Every structure is written in structure tokens, then in C-alpha cells.
Amino acid sequence: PPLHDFYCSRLLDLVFLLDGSSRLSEAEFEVLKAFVVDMMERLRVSQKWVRVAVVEYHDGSHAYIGLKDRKRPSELRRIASQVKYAGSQVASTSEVLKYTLFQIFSKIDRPEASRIALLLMASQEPQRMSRNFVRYVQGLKKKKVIVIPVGIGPHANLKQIRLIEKQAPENKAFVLSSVDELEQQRDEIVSYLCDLAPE
């Protein structure tokens, strides 16, 4: 039973991508996880309507929740709230986009629904890891996967946030001062990306 007044009841595959770099402290990574738990609280989770995936990315990625996982929305929300704090030196956006592209969406078995990748960025990956950044963002665009960059803090890769918002018309960027704005801007973000999914 929908916990809040907002209950996105659309056909959508929403992928939460969380920065696992030390650019976010252990406490700050908590607010972000809380932000994710909220969105899920304002979504209609189930293999039919909105499907969710939760990924913590560092130099590599750790998937806590995949789109096909069959579990109560409460369990999934519990899992996300228990995502272990990585704190790694690097959070490769390129690699986690590659994972989203070549694994999460290896095959597109739900064409009737919109595919969104919510990229919660808090850092800047080393330039040497970005060769295929555009290549992956472009690959994502061909499979109709929308990438919504959410910049968090003074270290988020603004250049990448910018480039992404460009590559595809639907890709819209959200820049924030800290993780304290996630909720100050939670409703707009949920409303926005819910209006991108079919009825």
C-alpha cells in the first residue's frame, strides 16, 4: 500500500547508480541511500510496473538489486538502506555505465517500459578511465536508456554531467550543492522521471 501521496504507477525500469568514492563520507553516503529509499517509497515496485536496480560503483561495481529480482518493495528498500559504504578512491562512471549497458540491459526484454539510469555522481574519475565514456553513453541512447545525471557536491564530474545531458534530448541533469538537497529536490526528480514512462 503506497506509503505516500506520490505513487509512480508506470511502466519503468529505474536504475539507481550510487557513487562509491570517498568523495562522499560514510555519513553522506547515508543521506544518498536515504534518498534512494525514498524514491523507491514513491514508486510502484513490481516486475509489471516499476522495476528497480541498485548499484554502488567504485573502480568496479557492486549490484545489490537487479531489475528481475523478485522481492517485496519493503525488502528491496531494506537492502538499499543496507548498502555497504565503499569509500574507494575512485568511482568510475564509465565502468558503471558499461555495466548498465552491457549487463543490466544486455537484452531489452521490456520494450513497453522506459529504461532510466539515475547516475548519482559525487566525484571525478581519472581521465584515463573515460576513453569509452561517450561510447557507452551513446550505446545507452541507442537502446533507449535514459541517463539522468545527478551531480552531488563540488567534486561531481560536471563535464560528464554536461556531456550526458547533451547526448540525448531526454537526458536531464540535476546539479546539487550537497546530499542535503537530495530531499529538497526529491519530489521534482521523482515527478520528472516518472513522466518519462508509459501509462
Partner: protein, 119 residues
């Protein structure tokens, strides 16, 4: 005039390292050795010779040599550099102590390198 294992030349300290890293690691590694140490940098041939004195190519202090360029379309099209992100291959310079010729290659490559600084 320099620390142990290192070598000296004109108030500057050098040191070849038989470790395989990519440019950025080589460069960082150098800086973590001594305060003011970087990947070797040649300001004249002579300096090169001394470094030779210390695969086939070693990383030197030249990074991102293409994305630090200015671009122009042959028809004078107007563009906003802000839109040209990582547009060229990320390449760095590696030296060949032998013929002493520099190679511009992918920075992700793993090459042995030389550090340098001043006391």
C-alpha cells in the same frame, strides 16, 4: 647531493624505476617519492643523455598531449570547446633511451619510468 639509490645531475635528482605503471601512476608515484619530484622532464638534449645513463620506452613528463590542443574545422565551422570532451585519444609521451626518440602512445600503457626533482 641526492638521497639513497637516486642519482644527481645539476642540482636535480633522477632515478629509473623498473616498475610497470601507466603514466598517471608513474607521475603520481614520482611525486610521492620526494617533495617536488615528477616524471623526468628534458629541457635540453644533455639532460636526456644523463637519463639514458640511468618496454623499450619509459614515461616522461608529458601528459594528455592531444586534448590540450586547439581544434578547427576545415570549413571554419564554429564550435564550443565545452562540447569537445575527451574528444582525442588520451595519450602520453614515452622516451626511448636508445635512439632517444619520443613516442606518443596511450597513457593506459604500462611502461617503466624515471623520476626527477631538486634538493
Amino acid at each position: 647531493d641526492c638521497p639513497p639509490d637516486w642519482s644527481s645531475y645539476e642540482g636535480h635528482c633522477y632515478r629509473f624505476f623498473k616498475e610497470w605503471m601507466h603514466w598517471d601512476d608513474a607521475e603520481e608515484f614520482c611525486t610521492e617519492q620526494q617533495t617536488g619530484a615528477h616524471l623526468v622532464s628534458f629541457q635540453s638534449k644533455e639532460e636526456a643523455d644523463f637519463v639514458r645513463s640511468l618496454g623499450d620506452v619509459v614515461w616522461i613528463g608529458l601528459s594528455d598531449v592531444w586534448n590540450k590542443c586547439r581544434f578547427e574545422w576545415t570549413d571554419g565551422m564554429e564550435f564550443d570547446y565545452d562540447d569537445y570532451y575527451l574528444i582525442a585519444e588520451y595519450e602520453c609521451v614515452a622516451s626511448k633511451p636508445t635512439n632517444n626518440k619520443w613516442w606518443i602512445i596511450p597513457c593506459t600503457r604500462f611502461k617503466n619510468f624515471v623520476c626527477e626533482f631538486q634538493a
